Design a protein around this nucleic acid. Sequence first.
RNA 1: UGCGAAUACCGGAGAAUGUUAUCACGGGAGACACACGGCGGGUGCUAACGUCCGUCGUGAAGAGGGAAACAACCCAGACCGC
RNA 2: GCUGCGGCAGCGACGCUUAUGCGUUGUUGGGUAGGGGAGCGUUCUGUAAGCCUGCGAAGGUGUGCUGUGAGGCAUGCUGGA
Lengths: 58, 117, 103, 140
Amino acid sequence: AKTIKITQTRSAIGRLPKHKATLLGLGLRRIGHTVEREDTPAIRGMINAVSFMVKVEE
Amino acid sequence: ARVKRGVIARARHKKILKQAKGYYGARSRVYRVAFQAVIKAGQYAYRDRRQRKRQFRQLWIARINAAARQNGISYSKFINGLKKASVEIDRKILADIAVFDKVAFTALVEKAKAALA
Amino acid sequence: MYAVFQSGGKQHRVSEGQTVRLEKLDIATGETVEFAEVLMIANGEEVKIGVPFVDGGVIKAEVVAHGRGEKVKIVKFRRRKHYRKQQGHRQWFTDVKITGISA
Amino acid sequence: MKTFTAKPETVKRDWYVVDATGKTLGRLATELARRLRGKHKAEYTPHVDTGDYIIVLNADKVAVTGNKRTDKVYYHHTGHIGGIKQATFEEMIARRPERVIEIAVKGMLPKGPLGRAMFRKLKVYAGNEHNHAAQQPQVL
RNA sequence: UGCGAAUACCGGAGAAUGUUAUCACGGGAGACACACGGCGGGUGCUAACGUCCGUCGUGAAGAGGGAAACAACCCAGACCGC
RNA sequence: GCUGCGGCAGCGACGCUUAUGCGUUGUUGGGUAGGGGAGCGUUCUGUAAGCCUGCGAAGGUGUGCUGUGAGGCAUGCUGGA
């Protein structure tokens, strides 16, 4: 899980398909922008591809 | 049915030709200047004002690093002391205290030196 | 006594100095309402008691004068690639003056 | 107001006297180059005209670290083509510390004009104290 | 090829998110010389800032920071002013 | 790049007000070919023997204010309708 409250990692346009997984998906725009999603399993899927990539901190 | 360009013809050239500085040779006398040079001016200008915000900062720290270190702790350690505070954080710029209120500044280096855990 | 504060840039180096700043909000015209700044004060910093903080007791602020909040400045500022030219543009503010009483 | 202390056109000049008879050689240049600019200096906004005033002594007592005593490219080619290039190792040149070695600061300064203002204007010599052809007055 | 991944692709539900991003029909197009870098390959000598496909990213049509100086590499994408 | 402060414009909302509109807010605003949308200015026609003018028109040159820009105006001087 661990997805409740996540701020973007730090990267402009460079990925290929993960951008849908995040910016176009999760709802993150520009770095540092944090989003707070629910705390259920279904969401972990998105952060996984971007594991060390994104930043979920607490 | 009259373009009679003459009518704005003049006003346009005159407009850009209005480069007081004169710059040098053709750079005022000839229309050639305008979009060649008057245009460069606009370009060189576009970046310098915004790129300048830092060129001074580079100076601000250049002097703080040159003032604060003379009395213990380098600029690297300075802002770190300063860093620890509840309200104590007044940024640089005014940081030039080293020029007018030396006593303040050196009384401010302790606010950091003695501050560094 | 010296002065010090931020609000749209740390512009508060000079003592009283009456220097430009930012803008009220709803409107500018002059007069006043008596707006104390905040204890960003360098303790005012100015006397036998120049203090590292600025924090030298609760409440310490100067009242805003509101000298003249108008004017602009105009700067062309125009970019252009090799096929275009946004060359045509302009954005300014009025920076209200403010004299500021004593610390 | 606009913060930046002006340029009083090289306002003050604090005189000094290094020793050079030390053992730091090349290391010394930096605190010798930083000085003629705005090192110990706080105010007097550099970038613009400025400087200080120190002076070297014998300096002939240097060894560098590694076998640099034996290296250092050093050539002062001239506008002469015809295949010139005057290479001389450090020790070969250390025989008469001239515009070089002690002058290792030149390559360390802003270069060109203004930086050029400080340049050799610190004096060098190679004998320490004896007949200081240089200004005897106030120094540290 | 008597075995067989990753994986891409196909369809089914589900929560959330993205100023229907999707599809259809209709007006106007331009566009079919692309170059480089990474990965998978034909070629060529696992030669070429070589050449021909695939795929992803950048340039083209992106300024800024970075690798001295280097369109394509790295970072980061420029509404204006401080 | 992000943040802070001010300002501009498009859209969704919010506060209301409510043709409407404005303040708050979220967000969008690199750009060749090219598509779409708004405008400035010039010569000529209507509105015009109305209005401006020899107590000085057009034009030339300076200046000041003004608009996002194309440009706008006010006026010194020249100028002679």
